[PDB]
Nucleic acid binder design. Structure first.
Ligand SMILES: Nc1ncnc2c1ncn2[C@@H]1O[C@H](CSCC[C@H](N)C(=O)O)[C@@H](O)[C@H]1O
Length: 568
DNA sequence: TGGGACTTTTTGA
DNA sequence: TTCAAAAAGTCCCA
């Protein structure tokens, strides 16, 4: 028997990293391909419909299409005599199965000419006369005028973010795919739209994509399109598990249909242990039914713009917290992203760097990283930011410009606002407002394994890897920073935030304002005790010679208080 | 070479 | 004028 994943693996090894990233050339492993193909084609009635059109618009070398060929050959061979009796007796013979499949059943598209030729040769070599016409298109699937729809669509689209995509192509996507593609969206949104649009009535689509669109702000329109145009049959969420070897992406498998049905429920399989060697096991189907995965059902008609895919216990937990809390962080706080210098090496220096003797302390700010943020407090800053925006006189401070900032001048000149003349070559790209940072505030890392909200007492500045917020004046008498960090750092709120948080990679969640500011908060009779416990924790943490042991006990007591307050 | 600590600036709006 | 989102992440080693 043939190894359908050998020539494709060799072609993958031939390419380098840049050409892979520019076109998203990362082929799917055999276990996922087997699961998707057998999920779509296990129950096909080949006698009822012996002309199923099965498409992969990103076929590549044909990881999906060769397995599809094998499944189709078995299907036809098992019912050849029934097909012979029901239809033309001379057309339906075993020796004619091959020519039939390639003529009517397998369709592939890809921009990669060499991959198309390799797949064509692989399809031809499935059998050892007239040259059979193989339905392989070398084209941009997002520009191709498709002349007919398809019974089944399987595959893996390219993933290209908003930085790696060309300007003109992005303009085309915004003009023609505006239903799913805006702002910081991804190309696989457009591939989702194209797959849905050319799926026949009653057809089935099943693809593996990144999982980020399930929760991300950019995926809202795509989620609406999917919810309103297809019936989502199944969502397999791998969370931070590594499905693609040596690839830093988080994957989900999605199966949907356009069948006219009153059924509106979705099977959701969510992995429970992200430390799993998926390729070690024989099938994905056995893994889904094991204890490594949990299964629940979600009513698609009950999906809002946010898809909250949790089991009944977590849904009850989330609903209790939502109903009890009358305020959100957005209601009471002002949030902002950190400084974006545009070139950190030019403006960020070690606080022991000798070059800081050239810079007057009026221009120097304390600089912290995401790892400097712990629970309730921030580590002492190790770095200084040169707030070069306040260097108005270019004639003076020429030592600073020539010996520190100018060492990267060329790179500083390639920033967007310098090319347009908005910024001077030595200025910060996005210097924000100094007064927002130089005050008591709360800071949290932009990516973390857990809630880490700290009170900043030292007017620390930061890059965009740290987000900040401060309480509005009108809400200062109702909420204090100590109480806020007390409740936000609790295990209750850790779980509550992770209910809807954007899962990025293994043990990493996105902590961005678009979801952090939606966290709801409460105040009740337990306010004083929670605030007092938080202040005790802060006092213990700030002592130079101290042990963190009692902090855990205080945290347990505070978690008990919060659970009592929220009735969970 | 797979697992863990850590996270820049480009970009549309 | 100036906000904030975005992992086919990056990068190192035992
Ligand atoms: N605009 C476009 N139209 C069609 N195919 C494209 C495309 N942009 C990228 N591709 C192709 O999409 C493929 C994604 S890699 C996945 C290949 C295959 N489906 C598998 O799972 O193994 C790449 O081979 C790339 O060449």
């Amino acid at each position: 028997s043939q190894d359908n994943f050998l020539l494709s693996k060799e072609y993958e090894n031939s390419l380098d990293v840049d050409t892979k990233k520019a076109s998203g050339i990362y082929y799917t492993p055999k276990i996922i391909v087997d699961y998707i193909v057998k999920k779509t084609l296990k129950n096909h009635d080949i006698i009822k419909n012996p002309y199923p059109r099965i498409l992969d618009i990103s076929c590549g070398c044909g990881n999906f299409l060769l397995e599809v060929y094998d499944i189709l050959y078995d299907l036809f061979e098992e019912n050849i005599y029934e097909l012979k009796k029901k239809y033309d007796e001379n057309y339906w013979t075993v020796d004619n199965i091959h020519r039939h499949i390639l003529n009517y059943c397998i369709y592939g598209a890809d921009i990669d000419e060499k991959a198309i030729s390799i797949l064509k040769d692989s399809l031809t070599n499935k059998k050892v006369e007239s040259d059979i016409k193989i339905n392989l298109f070398c084209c941009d699937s997002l520009k191709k005028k498709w002349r007919y729809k398809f019974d089944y669509i399987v595959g893996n689209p390219p993933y290209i973010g908003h930085k790696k995509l060309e300007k003109k192509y992005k303009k085309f996507l915004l003009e023609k795919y505006s239903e799913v593609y805006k702002d910081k969206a991804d190309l696989y949104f457009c591939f989702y739209k194209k797959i849905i649009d050319i799926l026949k009535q009653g057809g089935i689509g099943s693809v593996i994509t990144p999982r980020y669109f399930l929760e991300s702000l950019s995926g809202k329109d795509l989620r609406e399109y999917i919810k309103s145009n297809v019936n989502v049959q199944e969502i397999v969420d791998f969370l931070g598990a590594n499905i693609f070897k040596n690839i830093g992406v988080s994957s989900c498998i999605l199966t949907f249909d356009k069948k006219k049905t009153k059924e509106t429920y979705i099977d959701v399989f969510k992995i429970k242990n992200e430390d799993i060697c998926i390729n070690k096991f024989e099938t994905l189907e056995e893994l889904l039914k094991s204890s490594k995965f949990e299964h629940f059902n979600i009513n698609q008609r009950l999906l809002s713009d946010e898809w909250i895919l949790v089991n009944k216990d977590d849904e009850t937990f989330y609903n209790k917290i939502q109903e009890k809390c009358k305020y959100s962080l957005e209601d009471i706080a002002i949030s902002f992203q950190g400084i974006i210098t545009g070139c950190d090496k030019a403006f960020i220096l070690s606080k022991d760097d000798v070059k800081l003797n050239l810079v007057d302390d009026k221009f120097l700010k304390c600089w912290i990283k995401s790892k400097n943020i712990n629970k309730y407090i921030v580590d002492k800053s190790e770095y200084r930011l040169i707030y070069s925006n306040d260097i108005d006189n270019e004639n003076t401070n020429k030592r600073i410009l020539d010996e520190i900032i100018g060492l990267y001048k060329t790179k500083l000149e390639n920033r967007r606002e310098c090319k347009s003349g908005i910024r001077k070559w030595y200025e910060l790209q996005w210097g924000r407002e100094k007064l927002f940072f130089e005050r008591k505030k709360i800071m949290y890392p932009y990516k973390s394994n857990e809630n880490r909200f700290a009170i900043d007492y030292d007017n620390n500045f930061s890059s965009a890897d740290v987000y900040s917020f401060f309480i509005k004046e009108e809400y200062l008498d109702k909420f204090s920073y100590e109480y806020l960090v007390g409740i936000l750092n609790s295990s209750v709120y850790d779980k509550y935030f992770k209910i809807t948080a954007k899962k990025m990679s293994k043990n990493i969640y996105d902590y961005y304002p678009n979801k952090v500011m939606k966290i709801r908060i409460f105040r009740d009779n337990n306010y004083e005790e929670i605030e007092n416990l938080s202040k005790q924790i802060i006092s213990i943490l700030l002592n130079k010679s101290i042990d963190k042991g009692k902090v855990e006990k205080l945290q347990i007591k505070m978690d008990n208080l919060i659970m009592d307050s929220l009735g969970i």
